[PDB]
Structures are given as structure tokens and as C-alpha cells.
């Protein structure tokens, strides 16, 4: 009597898989009532997904309603999770499972099958190129010099523009092009670059000027930005 | 004139659903050689994450993030472009802001004139009713032939309706306790399980090393079905 798990697999964020339970040594009741999945995310515990319950009600976790199915095929004597729509967060091992079903008093579940792994990624990072910002943050006094370094991890010529952005409100464009001033920009910012490192400074700190600051590469699309530098008061 | 570009279409979604953004733009026309809108995101206290860039080509640009799933497009006779947002995920909760760029590989291509941004919520809608179990020790170490204790906590009354399994590493769970106290087929009675109120105790009489493994309590008073959080216990 077990349970066997097979579909996993590789997806990208909105893809679709299929998992199928075969039971072996038993026959599935009514509907397969009592099937269940369950799933664990790397290095996390168990989450309840799905059963198919009596007076064909099947239950189902919020976290998957409305993309994933539970059925079964008793003519089959498998049973199934449709998952649609997937997303990063279903990565896990997908786990069927025989819910107790003869007694009230008992729903716990048994004959676990050995899992199938499901993975949602739209990749590693690849060929992208990485923006390292340093600091990530500073605290400052008005009227200190403040410098912001940025790295490429290729070359990017000096295809390179930085950004303003203050709480609550829209990125602003302060340098292109490694150091050339945007309109409306005050003096005392200015941008450079040595190697692979740009640099941003703020000559004397004004109290305007706290606010995160973001590089930006455009040599190459996808269009990176470093994880920003926050520019706080002492 | 000053460029304005104003989003709208924002709100609240739920995961596997759609929805589409508009950037409105005034101040020059999208038709212009050399011009570009770009959608941009920022989730909550996180930075900026490019996601789509109109170009001139019949092929526009995207993120692999959200390729396959999202569409960039403008409509030219209302001066205002698009993103068409599909099959969405928690993970897409963000301020989407559009901007200003170029449509060719120009040496000083920026983004510029970016918007007040319009937030996208991917919510399920639901929770506030779910039975929470709290498991503690969330670890513990102890040697062969102790008696160790392993609690979880209901956030509810649920009757008797607990279950205990336990995790070998690299298998899947077993049963050992279910119904409170009932012991599952194959499983020795150097294990039990009682229950007082809401506080519910696994304990492990005559600790073996093959009990290395990690154990969950799990109630099924009512759906959805929920675990506690898991204790590994170590055997030294």
C-alpha cells in the first residue's frame, strides 16, 4: 500500500504543472474522498493545500484557491493537483496523502507518498548585470561630503544614470550618462567613474538631500539598478 | 510644457488574476522618434526592479521576471500606453510607476518624468479565521533513553482533533499520533499524546536515535487544515 508522487518540476512563474498520486495495494473510495496534498518549502514545514472531502466539497488552503484543483479518477485510481498559474512561492516538495476516512473521530494522514519537487523561477540572475551599491545606508551631518559607490560586474561602458527617490514619492533623475547634470539638478551632485566603480557624490549635504539614492546600467537590457544607498540624518 | 505621466488602474487582486495599468502621458506624444515609456516597480521597502521598455522594434523589452505574463503596449490615439498585467502573485505587490525613455540605444538613455506610481495589492483575501498552532520547543537536544516533551498550543478550542507526524530527514512524514492520544498502527507506546485545554503534548518515552526527525502537530477541528511549525529534535 503506497502512494507514488510523479509531474514535478522546472516552471517559470505563470506556468502550469500537473501532479499525479497513483495508489497501489488499495482502491481509492468515492472520489477519491480523503485525498490530500500537502506541500514543504525548502528547509520549512507542512502546509496543508487541498482534500477532497464529502458531499463533493473540496477544500481547499487560501495560498491556492482558485489556481490549483484536486480530482481524482477512481477508473484510474489516481489523483490529481492541477496547478495553474504558478508562482514563485509554490516552490516546494508536493506531497499526496490518504486522509483517514472510516471514522468521524479520525481525518489524520496517511501513506504518504515520497514527494515530487517543484520549482517556480524565472532564473538565477543568468547573463544579468549586477549593480553592487555601497553603503547600503549612512548617516550624515548637513554640510558632511557624502560618496556613493556603484559596481558593475561587467563592463558597462559609461552607459551608467543615478536616482533620487524620497519617501513617499517618485524616483527622480539626477545624473546620465556617468556625469552629465540633469536640468534642475543642484551643483554640489556630481558623478564619475573609476574601473567598474561609480561613484555619486554630494559635495556638503544639504537637508534636502536625505533620501535613498539608486544607480542604474542601461549598456544592456534587462535595465539594473542597484539595491539603493538611504541618506540619513544624524 | 512641462512632461506629465500620470498612472491609474491599480488596487487590489487576487493571485492568478489580472489586471491592467495606464500611463497617461501629456507634455510630448508617444509617436516621437526616440521615445520610450517604462514601467518600473518597487515592492514594499525594497528598490526599483525594471520591468518593461516600448521600443521600436515589432519586439518591445521585458524582465524575465515577468515575461510571458505581463504586456506592454501603448494606444497612440489616447496618448497613453499599457501594462496588462496576467497570472499575478503575491510576489507582484508594488508601486508601479512608468517613466519617460528612449525607444533606441542612445548613449544617454534615462528614465525621466516618472510618475506618482499606482500600488498593486496581490491579496488572497483571506485568513483572519484560520486555527493557529503554536509548537514549542522549536528544537531540542537529549540522549538515548531520555523522556523529552514536545507542546503545541491551539489558538481555538478544537475538541480532540490533533494529529502528530513525524519527519525523517529526506522523507516524507509518518503518522505516530492521532485523535489526541490514539496510537497509529506500527507505532511503539514509548509515544503519547494528551491534551489539556488547548495545549496539546507529544511525549517520547525511551528517546532512540532513529527519533532524529523533526515533529508537527496538526489539528482538523475545522478547515483549513493547519500545523504547527515543526520541532527537530536532536539525539547526542
Known amino acids: 500500500v503506497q502512494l507514488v508522487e510523479s509531474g514535478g518540476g522546472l516552471v517559470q512563474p505563470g506556468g502550469s504543472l500537473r501532479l499525479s498520486c497513483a495508489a497501489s495495494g488499495f482502491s481509492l473510495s468515492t472520489s477519491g474522498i480523503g485525498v490530500t496534498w500537502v506541500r514543504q518549502a525548502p528547509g520549512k514545514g507542512l502546509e496543508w493545500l487541498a482534500t477532497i472531502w464529502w458531499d463533493d466539497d473540496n477544500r481547499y488552503a487560501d495560498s491556492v484557491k482558485g489556481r490549483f484543483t484536486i480530482s481524482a479518477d477512481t477508473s484510474k485510481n489516481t489523483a490529481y493537483l492541477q496547478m495553474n498559474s504558478l508562482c514563485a512561492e509554490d516552490t516546494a516538495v508536493?506531497?499526496?496523502?490518504?486522509?483517514?476516512?472510516?471514522?468521524?473521530?479520525?481525518?489524520?494522514?496517511?501513506?504518504?507518498?515520497?514527494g515530487t519537487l517543484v520549482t517556480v523561477s524565472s532564473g538565477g540572475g543568468g547573463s544579468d548585470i549586477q549593480m553592487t551599491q555601497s553603503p547600503s545606508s549612512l548617516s550624515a551631518s548637513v554640510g558632511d561630503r557624502v560618496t556613493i559607490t556603484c559596481r558593475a560586474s561587467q563592463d558597462i561602458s559609461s552607459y551608467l544614470n543615478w536616482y533620487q527617490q524620497k519617501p513617499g514619492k517618485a524616483p527622480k533623475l539626477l545624473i546620465y550618462?556617468?556625469?552629465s547634470l540633469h536640468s534642475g539638478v543642484p551643483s554640489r551632485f556630481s558623478g564619475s567613474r573609476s574601473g567598474t566603480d561609480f561613484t555619486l557624490t554630494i559635495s556638503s549635504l544639504q537637508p534636502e538631500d536625505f533620501a535613498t539614492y539608486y544607480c542604474q546600467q542601461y549598456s544592456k537590457f534587462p535595465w539594473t539598478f542597484g539595491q539603493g544607498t538611504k541618506v540619513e540624518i544624524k | 510644457m512641462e512632461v506629465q505621466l500620470v498612472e491609474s488602474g491599480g488596487g487590489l487582486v487576487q493571485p492568478g488574476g489580472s489586471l491592467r495599468l495606464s500611463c497617461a502621458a501629456s507634455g510630448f506624444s508617444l509617436s516621437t522618434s526616440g521615445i520610450g515609456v517604462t514601467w518600473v516597480r518597487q515592492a514594499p521597502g525594497k528598490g526599483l526592479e525594471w520591468l518593461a521598455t516600448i521600443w521600436w522594434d515589432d519586439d518591445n523589452r521585458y524582465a524575465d521576471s515577468v515575461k510571458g505574463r505581463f504586456t506592454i503596449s501603448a494606444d497612440t490615439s489616447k496618448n497613453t500606453a499599457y501594462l496588462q498585467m496576467n497570472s499575478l502573485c503575491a510576489e507582484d505587490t508594488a508601486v508601479y510607476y512608468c517613466?519617460?525613455?528612449?525607444?533606441?540605444?542612445?548613449?544617454?538613455?534615462?528614465?525621466?518624468?516618472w510618475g506618482q506610481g499606482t500600488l498593486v495589492t496581490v491579496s488572497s483575501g483571506g485568513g483572519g479565521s484560520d486555527i493557529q498552532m503554536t509548537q514549542s520547543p522549536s528544537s531540542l537536544s537529549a540522549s538515548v533513553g531520555d523522556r523529552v516533551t514536545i507542546t503545541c498550543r491551539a489558538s481555538q478550542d478544537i475538541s480532540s482533533y490533533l494529529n502528530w507526524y513525524q519527519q525523517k530527514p529526506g522523507k516524507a512524514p509518518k503518522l505516530?499520533?492521532?485523535?489526541?492520544?490514539?496510537?497509529?498502527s506500527g507505532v511503539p507506546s514509548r509515544f503519547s499524546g494528551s491534551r489539556s485545554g488547548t495545549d496539546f503534548t507529544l511525549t517520547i518515552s525511551s528517546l532512540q536515535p532513529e527519533d532524529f526527525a523533526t515533529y508537527y502537530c496538526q489539528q482538523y477541528s475545522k478547515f483549513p487544515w493547519t500545523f504547527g511549525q515543526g520541532t527537530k529534535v536532536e539525539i547526542k
Open positions: 517613466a519617460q525613455s528612449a525607444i533606441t540605444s542612445v548613449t544617454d538613455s534615462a528614465m525621466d518624468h
Open positions: 550618462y556617468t556625469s
